[PDB]
Each structure stands twice: as structure tokens, then as C-alpha cells.
Design an enzyme around this catalytic site. Structure first.
Site, PDB file in Angstrom:
ATOM      1  N   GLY A   1       0.804  -1.205   0.000  1.00 20.65           N
ATOM      2  CA  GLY A   1       0.000   0.000   0.000  1.00 20.65           C
ATOM      3  C   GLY A   1       0.840   1.259   0.000  1.00 20.65           C
ATOM      4  CD  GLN A   2       6.684   1.456   0.112  1.00 20.45           C
ATOM      5  OE1 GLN A   2       7.138   1.280  -1.019  1.00 20.45           O
ATOM      6  NE2 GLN A   2       7.457   1.709   1.164  1.00 20.45           N
ATOM      7  NE  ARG A   3       1.769   9.170  -0.595  1.00 20.30           N
ATOM      8  CZ  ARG A   3       0.810   9.069   0.321  1.00 20.30           C
ATOM      9  NH1 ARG A   3       1.006   8.345   1.415  1.00 20.30           N
ATOM     10  NH2 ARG A   3      -0.345   9.694   0.145  1.00 20.30           N
TER      11      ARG A   3
ATOM     12  CB  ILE B   1       2.814  -0.478  -4.123  1.00 23.29           C
ATOM     13  CG1 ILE B   1       4.328  -0.508  -3.908  1.00 23.29           C
ATOM     14  CG2 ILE B   1       2.292  -1.889  -4.366  1.00 23.29           C
ATOM     15  CD1 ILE B   1       5.083  -1.212  -5.018  1.00 23.29           C
TER      16      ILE B   1
END
Ligand code: GNP
Ligand code: MG
Lengths: 171, 174
Positions: free
Chosen positions: B65-67, B69
Site C-alpha cells: 500500500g505504498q504510494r 504500489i
């Protein structure tokens, strides 16, 4: 050269030779971690990861494991693979792992990962209830070390890229 | 003897775990799989749990849920049977942000009619907003054309996780 997943699901026994060269891994996929654990007790049976490469003593992609007979009476096992992907994009990554014992298909694991993010690091744990083995199969598998063998085929866009093999013994 | 071909259904249940970074998706998944959660790192990719029983497969996907990804979430939508969306209940600054992501998810046609369980995770914290308050912020009651459910939970302790999974099992095939 021209190995599709369909011509691999029909095999009845371990292949005699590798079906591709290490140079075929054009997507720089690197398996960085492997783990076997008994999921009934939680015990981590075997694990080797990141800087550790081997505990040893044609192609350098062959491992073989030995267990005590108790392993063949385990209820559920969990095998985890962790691999990284490189710059090149990967659409439809697939994995087909087949365990035989002398032309006897024990277990088939066919998983389609699909898209892999570039420069990603992914894991997959297969948690399986141990296959239904008759006591005859137990007898033979115990008594014949390393005649239980496995083929690990890895495909990208239905084109085999990586082939690892393994033999298992229970003595 | 008692050897019985009870199986042979060849079923496939797909659970997709989404949510912002730091929500607890990987911690939740490894908790569900009774796995070591002592050294979790931000997932730069996906973590799969493929649980088999004689041809019945339950596949659970934890996507980062990284920016950097989130744009790739759209690649892992096909064939999803349940969506589990995780929200850090203590990170209020990000409610609005996460509220939009879920809103984008439930408008995606590739995910239409898929039941969505909203885990209001990290309820073990003093600062954790209650589930009703989060459901307000998310406007979850306007959700139409699918069955949804919110569940207070703490992936760290395990509190509430089985309730959410009970809902997921009850509202599968939907
Ligand atoms: N106090 C508390 N901390 C939690 C809880 N669940 C997760 N955390 C913590 O919150 C952080 C979030 O990490 P992680 O589980 O990787 O979240 P994630 O959804 O995987 N984020 P990403 O998309 O980057 O992989 C971790 O430090 C984790 O230990 C919870 O219920 N309570
Ligand atoms: Mg994660």
C-alpha cells in the site's frame, strides 16, 4: 526451447534433464528465501534466506532434502518462496511444481502469480494438507531414499524460464 | 475402506487485501497464517497465502500500500471473491485519504458486487478511533450494489479478526 505449461502438466515422471539454461532467466528473477514449516505445531522445519546460500558438505539449481519418517505422518505443511523481480516488466508469472515417486504423481502445485511489479519482492506460501498416501506408498517412500523427486518449473508468458529440481528422502 | 472421494470440486476462493501503507495488511495476513510477525517490512509487491485441501484452494493476496504500489492494485483485481480493506484506526490524518482509495475501489468495474470487509485495525491503541466513527468518515452506509461490513480489530492481538473472517465466510458466493 518451446516448453509450454501444457506440455509439462502431462509429464508422468521427473525429467531426465533441465529444459532450459540459467541464461533463459532474462527477467533477473532471484529466489531469495525458502521455508518449510509444520503448520500444526508451527515448527519451522527448514529455512534458508538472503545472504545464506548453502550448508553443503551441469547446472547449479539442484537441492535435495532428507527427513525422519515422522514427516510422512504430518497433517499440514507450509512451503514459502520469496523472489525478487528486476527492471524488465513481467506479466503472467506462473509456477508449476510436481512431486513424483517413480512415475507416481504425489502432489501438483499450479499457481499463476500473474503480473509482478518491477523491482518488487514477493512471497508465496503454499499451505497444503499432506496428500492422501496409502501405507504402501509410505513403506516405499521411506525405504527408497531420493527416488521421490520433484520438478519446479517457472513460466513467464507461457514460456519456461527456470527449472529447478529436487529429490527427497525420509530416512 | 473409509477412503472417500469427498472432494473433487476444484473450487477457488480469492481474497484480496488492500488498504493504505502501514494499515496492517501484512501483519493481518501473517496472523491469519499463524506466522512470525516479529520483523514485518513494507511490502514492495505481494504476499500470497495459498491454502489447499484436496483441490479446494483459498488464495489470499496482500498487496503493498505504498504510494508507489497503489497504482498496481488494478493489476490484481480479476477473479476476486472477497475484498478485505484495512484501515489504521489510529491514523486519523489519513482517513480522508483512505476514504478516497476505497471509494475508487468500489467504483472499479473489475470489483463490482465483490463483498468488502472493512477492518478498522489497531483497536488495541488508545488513539484508535471507534469503528462507527470510521464508518461515518467513509460514508459506508451509502454503499449499494454489494454487501459490506466493518469490524473493529487488532491484527497485533488478534481481537476481532475471527469475527471479520466469520463474516467473510458467511458472505462468500456473493
Ligand atoms: N499497535 C498495533 N500495531 C499494529 C497493528 N497491526 C499492525 N500494526 C503495526 O503497524 C505497522 C504496519 O505494518 P504492516 O503490517 O506491514 O502494514 P502493511 O499493510 O503491510 N503496509 P504496506 O502496504 O507498506 O506493506 C507495523 O509496525 C505493524 O506491526 C495493530 O493491531 N496494533
Ligand atoms: Mg504489506
Amino acid at each position: 526451447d518451446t516448453i509450454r505449461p501444457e506440455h509439462v502438466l502431462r509429464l508422468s515422471r521427473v525429467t531426465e534433464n533441465y529444459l532450459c539454461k540459467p541464461e533463459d532467466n532474462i527477467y533477473s528473477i532471484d529466489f531469495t528465501r525458502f521455508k518449510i514449516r509444520d503448520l500444526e505445531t508451527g515448527t519451522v522445519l527448514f529455512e534458508i534466506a538472503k545472504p545464506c546460500v548453502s550448508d553443503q558438505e551441469s547446472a547449479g539449481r539442484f537441492v535435495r532434502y532428507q527427513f525422519t519418517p515422522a514427516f510422512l505422518r504430518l497433517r499440514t505443511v507450509g512451503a514459502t518462496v520469496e523472489f525478487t523481480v528486476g527492471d524488465k516488466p513481467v506479466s503472467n508469472f506462473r509456477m508449476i511444481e510436481r512431486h513424483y515417486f517413480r512415475e507416481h504423481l504425489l502432489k501438483n502445485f499450479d499457481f499463476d502469480f500473474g503480473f509482478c511489479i518491477p523491482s518488487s519482492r514477493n512471497t508465496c506460501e503454499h499451505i497444503y494438507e499432506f496428500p492422501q498416501l496409502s501405507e504402501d506408498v509410505i513403506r516405499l517412500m521411506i525405504e527408497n531414499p531420493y527416488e521421490t523427486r520433484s520438478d519446479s518449473f517457472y513460466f513467464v508468458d507461457n514460456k519456461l524460464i527456470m527449472h529447478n529440481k529436487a529429490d527427497y528422502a525420509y530416512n | 475402506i473409509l477412503r472417500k472421494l469427498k472432494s473433487a470440486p476444484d473450487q477457488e476462493v480469492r481474497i484480496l487485501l488492500l488498504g493504505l501503507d502501514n494499515a496492517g495488511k501484512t501483519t493481518l495476513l501473517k496472523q491469519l497464517a499463524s506466522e512470525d510477525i516479529s520483523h514485518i517490512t513494507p511490502t514492495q509487491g505481494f504476499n500470497i497465502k495459498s491454502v489447499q485441501s484436496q483441490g479446494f484452494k483459498l488464495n489470499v493476496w496482500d498487496i503493498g500500500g505504498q504510494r508507489k504500489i497503489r497504482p498496481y492494485w488494478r493489476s490484481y483485481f480479476e477473479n476476486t471473491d472477497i475484498l478485505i480493506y484495512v484501515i489504521d484506526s489510529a491514523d486519523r490524518k489519513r482517513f480522508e485519504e483512505t476514504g478516497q482509495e476505497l471509494t475508487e475501489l468500489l467504483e472499479e468495474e473489475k470489483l463490482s458486487c465483490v463483498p468488502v470487509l472493512i477492518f478498522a485495525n489497531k483497536q488495541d491503541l488508545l488513539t484508535a478511533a471507534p469503528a462507527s466513527e470510521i464508518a461515518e468518515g467513509l460514508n459506508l452506509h451509502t454503499i449499494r450494489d454489494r454487501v459490506w461490513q466493518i469490524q473493529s480489530c487488532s491484527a497485533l492481538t488478534g481481537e476481532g479478526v475471527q469475527d471479520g473472517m466469520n463474516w467473510v465466510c458467511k458472505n462468500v458466493n456473493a
